[model samples]
Target: MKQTYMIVNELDVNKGGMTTAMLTRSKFFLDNEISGDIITFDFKANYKDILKELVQSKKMDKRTQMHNPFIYFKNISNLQHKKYNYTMTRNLSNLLKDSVEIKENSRISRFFNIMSREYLAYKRETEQETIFDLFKNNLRYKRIYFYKGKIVKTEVFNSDNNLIAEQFYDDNGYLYLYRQINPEKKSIGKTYLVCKEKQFKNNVEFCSYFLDKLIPDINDNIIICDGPGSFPKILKTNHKNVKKFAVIHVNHYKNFDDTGAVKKQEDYILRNANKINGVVMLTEAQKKDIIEKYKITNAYVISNFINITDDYRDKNDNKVVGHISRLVPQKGLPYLIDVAKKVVEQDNSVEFHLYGTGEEKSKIENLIQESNLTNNVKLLGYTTNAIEKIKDFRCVISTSQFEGQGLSLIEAMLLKKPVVAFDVKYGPSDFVKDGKNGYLIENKDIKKMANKILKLLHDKELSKSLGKHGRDTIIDMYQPEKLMVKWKQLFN
Candidate 1:
């Protein structure tokens, strides 16, 4: 049987677009009876707990196979007796009741100090016990990480509060690996694998070694690199007869324009495209551009797809316009805010609710407040039920500067919600047809964008007609059966 592996950095409860794409593809592959698994390289000590939560929350598929190098090493190690002695072996309630008084105890975390009320340690009691800054004067010298109430990892910090070392432990509490860091350089100095009596120069080297061990020297293995971080690691693997593929998850050009030079981050993968079996582009436009520029015939277009079903819900009577995207500059959220200001100035009845979270959240909030859109525009933080939220809105909008087949737009269209998006470089143009399925405004044209949004808000019949067309278009365009056939072809 052929085995397929999707490589990524890590899978978390709040996943980004790239991780979501990987999960969606993995589900499609597994549902079709394809033997597939995901390989994550990032070092998360409580990964099992995370996976368990993800499965319980229904964010991650329970049947989806998962593999990690840290867990693998710990499972294979024989140091079942080497347990690290923790400072407080009992629960916080028992330990802090007497000499150390609890300063503040919330549902999330607990802060405590000695009777003298000197700065002690910060404790978080969740699925795991995480003790932060376990030193006097609140120096933050170390942090102890727990898994199922056992010490699984410990992080040591310097006087400057910089991470100096990370010690990993097995289920038996055996200290199996130690990662030494160069604080100034912000790089791993060395990684010591105690069980094998081996040392790797860096985390990448350690992960590469793990990959070399995980993949068999056989012909029936397929590996797909989903993120740029995993690209070089997959390429550098010593395994033979393993078909490798890389996915371009975002705009690869310097200025989000295909005609511009390739971005530095994507330079290595594109330059070394010949080494890989194929390069997966999310859109035909991107594929064509890459093929023309690099003269690589291996480029293939396999769009990010959503499972199409009769899961549509009736739109609510609330006159709300929805925007679902990460609050980042790439998303051009400021432009969306400007459009919102214009729409509300004309009609305050229409509300704009922007979802998803990122570093630019503060800036977006300030922009909303400064523009006096505090009541008209809302900054709804990250949400998992994006599709359900779309069903409640009158319509959806995207202000992204560029995209790798905007998944949210497809999702909105799938829910029969009329979409109004800026005509960006790649994604929105593919599915959104001007006045047919949804409105495609000229990139950065706030006035025109506002008018289109108002038109949809005011005319119920036109919005319904456009939304119905959108649902039909997405249902036909992004059927899993059709998209999976492309994967089948690639695998063959």
Candidate 2:
């Protein structure tokens, strides 16, 4: 069997749409008995715990392997437990024992200095321990990362809360590497490997080295780069025997509109398209656009699969319209807010539930307050259970300027909730049928968007009909088996 690897920056409990789609793909690969593993480059202390939660919650398959440079260098296995025997200074240990336990929880514990009674340090059980500099207004000074009760890494921060240095330990708790961080540049200035007596410029170089060691030159290995951050590095790796593929998760053009120049982030991969074995696009329209612009013959379309559930139920009778997306400019949230204002004017009882969190959160909150739509619009921050929430919504709406495939819209439709979305470049048109399954409003047309939403809220029978048709349309088109055949072709 050929070894397959998916490269990503990180995976967390509350992830964005891209990560969610990646996990679903991995699960499908596992179910088909494919040798699929995920390779993450970011440094997180409790990756094992995160993977555990994902597996326990049935979001990811337990058989899927996970790899990281830090974990590899430390020689830490997910199933192994090593007791932490590193001792703090006897004086400090005694001081902590006598100090009052100020805060206590299953996740963390805080201690107060015995004499001064000021905050001293907090131990995040099973994760890491952080010490505060009381003299520096309780700013975080140092953090010790623990793995299975063993000390594996330590990070030192300055008064400005910037990382200054980091130390890595082997499984035996021996210091093996040290990294000096350039706080001003926010990059790794240098890294020293104690055992090899070698040096690296930055973390990216270190990760590339790790990949070189991981991918064997003789095997028929395959790598799929999922994000822009990992694309160049994966391409630059020394493994010549590996087949490289890139997955375009969003529109490749500037502003994701696809009518203008290529996005700077996507420029590198598209410019070097010939170097990759395949460039997987989510929709056929996007694949055609890329071929026309870049003249690449390797572009392939493999849409995301919908995990059809048997628990489909009738939507609640509430007049709530749902918007599930990151609070960012690309999502056109301000346009959604404008539509919400108009809907509220005609029907105050109609509520809009916006679920997500991002840099534009404060701006969205300010707009809601200024427009006096706070009572009508509720900003429910990041949710892990988006499907459950969508089931209660009367309908869903999307005001995105562009999309890769509008995963959220398809998800809502799979739950039998009619969606009103802006007809964007790549996704909405492919899935939504105007006046049949869902409403496809013209891009950024706030008046028509509001009017369409009002129509769905008023006509119960029409809403039910559209929603039922929406689910049927998705079920017919997005079966996992059909899409997995494309992946099988690529792998073969």
Candidate 3:
């Protein structure tokens, strides 16, 4: 039987690069008549509304909104119908014995009933006829487990102080689910143990155990992972007959430190190379590095791609530059701010526009103010229209510390905009040919990057030449149709 191929990731569509790639790839699969669906742990918004929110709010604070993402999205909007199928863990709740629908404002009554009747509470104090409901806050707590002083499992509780779920940990490292508790008074009487036989210390063992629980007794299915994490490891080990594969989103290393997270993960996967059927990387640089360093022969190089339709060229305002990336430390925004100051000194007319949002927004804003370049630089916020708006700038810039692939830079290139980027690992350099498509500056050299941006601003012909070439490079190699073929080959 032809197996169902599922692309799994813990994401919402608007979560940035990884999510973008997964959705794009899922579309490719569906369009090709492939039997597959995308699985996400959390995502609770209509497509159009979420994009509008991302563009407007600049950040989605999970603490303030969307507290219960465990609920699967069954009513996905029609726009994304052809792209992929969305399913979540919450959808599986019905599979449990005696699944019950929870109602609002009944937590206290439920708590009193369960605790007093089941005798679960520590104290058997006499209950009042009426419990205060003046405060309407749903209470929750996280429990952390440690082994040998190392943190392992952590769990969160519902308002009624019931253990909704428990995760396990071990000295072997990684993350995994230990057990899932059904809610309400009789939860213990109706519990689901994911592990049928034994649970291992590491994530692989735990993940595999849960796989048997989540998706067991399947005659034909192949697991496909969008990015790295312990989930892929589990799928590899736990599946009885299903095959497993992963798409490597970033260059696993820029400069390998003996004690870095990437190194640890790389080593972990290397140790179990045989468990993984194959891997996909976005760049040849990453592909070559993975095969040589990890000693894995099953590696494939696939460029990030999208279907090019219109040859869009927005009228560029004079001396305008653009940047689109997550507002994170690794994006080198601090250095970009410094570079902005330098550019403003040399050319007062130059303006820099930044897009995207994350933890680094306030920091970047503060630096821009501290540098007194607030007038010269502006944070335009996150946008689903990055590709459309990018054409307004004469040039695009990137200063990432590292990337799996710089999707924004590629988008800019596709629009025929000259790029000035830091020659970082696995991405910018791969796309920005020095002085051909765009200028690749020495990493973290603010003065040089400023000078390059100035060059693009002043020399219209040079900028135009590089921009045209950039578009040509994209068209030559990274078309969506070609990438679709590669994906088809991998799936087959």
lDDT tens digits by residue: candidate 2, 147-223: 66566677888888888998877666677778999888878778887766779887777788889988786446889
Among the numbered candidates, top lDDT falls to 2
Residue 157 in model 2: lDDT? 89
lDDT of 1 by residue, 1-492 (tens): 767889987878777778777777877787888767889987886677788987786656777778888888988874555555443345434434544435466534445545656655677665445454466566878787766667777888888888999888776656789999886776777999997899988888888889889888576789999878778788878877888989898878876555677877577888889999898999989888778778887899888867674664584867899988777788898898999989999998889988888999999889989999999899889887777788899999888898877888887887878999998767788888899988888888999999999999998888888989998998778778888899889888
CA RMSD, predictions in order? 3.7, 4.0, 11.8
Question: Candidate 1: where are CA atoms >4 Å away?
Answer: 78-127, 130-140, 255-259, 313-315
Q: How high is each candidate's TM-score?
A: 0.90, 0.87, 0.68
User: Model 1, poorest ten-residue lDDT window?
Assistant: 86-95
lDDT of each: 0.81, 0.82, 0.61
